[PDB]
Design a protein around this ligand. Sequence first.
Ligand code: FAD
Ligand code: FAD
Lengths: 196, 195
Amino acid sequence: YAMSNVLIINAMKEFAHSKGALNLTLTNVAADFLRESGHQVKITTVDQGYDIESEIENYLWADTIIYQMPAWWMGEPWILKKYIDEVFTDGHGRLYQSDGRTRSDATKGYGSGGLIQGKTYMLSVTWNAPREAFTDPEQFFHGVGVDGVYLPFHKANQFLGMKPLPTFMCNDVIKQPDIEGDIARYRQHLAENVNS
Amino acid sequence: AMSNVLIINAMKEFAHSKGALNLTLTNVAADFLRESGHQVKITTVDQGYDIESEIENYLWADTIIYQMPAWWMGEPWILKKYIDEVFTDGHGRLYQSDGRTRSDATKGYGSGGLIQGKTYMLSVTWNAPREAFTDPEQFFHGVGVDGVYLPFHKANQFLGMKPLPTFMCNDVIKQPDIEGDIARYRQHLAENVNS
Ligand SMILES: Cc1cc2nc3c(=O)[nH]c(=O)nc-3n(C[C@H](O)[C@H](O)[C@H](O)COP(=O)(O)OP(=O)(O)OC[C@H]3O[C@@H](n4cnc5c(N)ncnc54)[C@H](O)[C@@H]3O)c2cc1C
Ligand SMILES: Cc1cc2nc3c(=O)[nH]c(=O)nc-3n(C[C@H](O)[C@H](O)[C@H](O)COP(=O)(O)OP(=O)(O)OC[C@H]3O[C@@H](n4cnc5c(N)ncnc54)[C@H](O)[C@@H]3O)c2cc1C
């Protein structure tokens, strides 16, 4: 005997042709909308630094983890890979227990040794690439979709026991900025997938 | 005319990874390739690097081999940092654009590379068993090692390069097999890197 607890991990970074403003904006849009909607929200700003232990506790507290990030060389910026390499690993015993296999039947069960089953996660990504690069079979990603491109990132999260919510993506963000459209679409996405 | 080979060793001592298998395989490749007549250069990512020198190394190389452990389903963060710095700073030399240099912006993404003709190869070490990649009911839904490494492949292909077949060692923690790893890797190099 409110709404779901949400942790937003903002992986914005000012570097070369990325200035981090779109990712900061979408982080704030989600935080404000979700809070308005009744969710408690915590925000981690990766590039600013973080306390590994606190982050592990944040995952345990969260019902849903949103990764807000730009696309850097087809995936997460290095700062976010460092964050999971530190946080997930140090989370051994609390976020996951094992690889889910037995030495007895070693070919089976990989990825079933998580401890945070029940929690969900969602990718919110920003790309210079057009949406068609992911869906047109003759284009760069051979039709595998955004979730095919992010398959290893998805699987790192699923190894802990989590399941994904549908991915949100903004495309052509450099050549054809559409902040108003991004915000409207994102609010709609959050209303459908994160609010319940 | 054996290919110039750049080996990028992304080993890192951290938590349960001691880096020894990746260092061993880096050496196995360097020695075998040198004996076979290739010029070889080695970048040890965790020990540090000069970005300009690395850009020059890619231009020098005919084939780039990434020797790396699997960390959270992919490359260690140090190697993602290496490409985020080197590939980006290499704009104008390693790649020119995203390939959309004419009116039709929904098309051509990834065709703006500059190092077409060069090849790259992944040499990876995993605790996961080989069946996790191939058995359709297992974790990776049968997409294979190259499906798991899709984004890393595509980062390299955006520069214009094409892959050689991937080499993988599996169950490296619970069931080490250094002798087998070495024999299999030499065979893989002979078939794919030697010409
Ligand atoms: C190293 C590196 C690698 C990359 N690799 C890839 C890749 O592999 N694939 C790919 O598709 N892209 C890639 N890019 C592009 C990258 O994805 C984009 O730069 C990033 O998504 C932009 O997000 P940002 O938060 O940095 O926004 P910013 O760069 O700050 O802003 C982007 C645009 O949105 C506008 N904007 C942002 N916020 C607001 C606001 N609140 N109001 C009005 N306008 C706003 C800005 O004015 C600007 O026009 C890469 C970039 C770098 C630096
Ligand atoms: C943060 C982190 C995340 C990880 N994520 C994943 C993952 O998502 N998926 C996955 O499958 N695995 C993962 N692992 C496991 C990781 O892939 C292995 O630890 C790595 O491949 C081992 O390679 P290494 O070079 O560090 O070897 P080491 O750890 O140094 O050695 C591995 C074994 O090989 C032996 N060995 C090495 N070289 C020799 C030699 N020359 N002679 C005799 N014996 C030798 C060692 O004694 C040891 O038994 C992760 C590990 C870490 C630390």
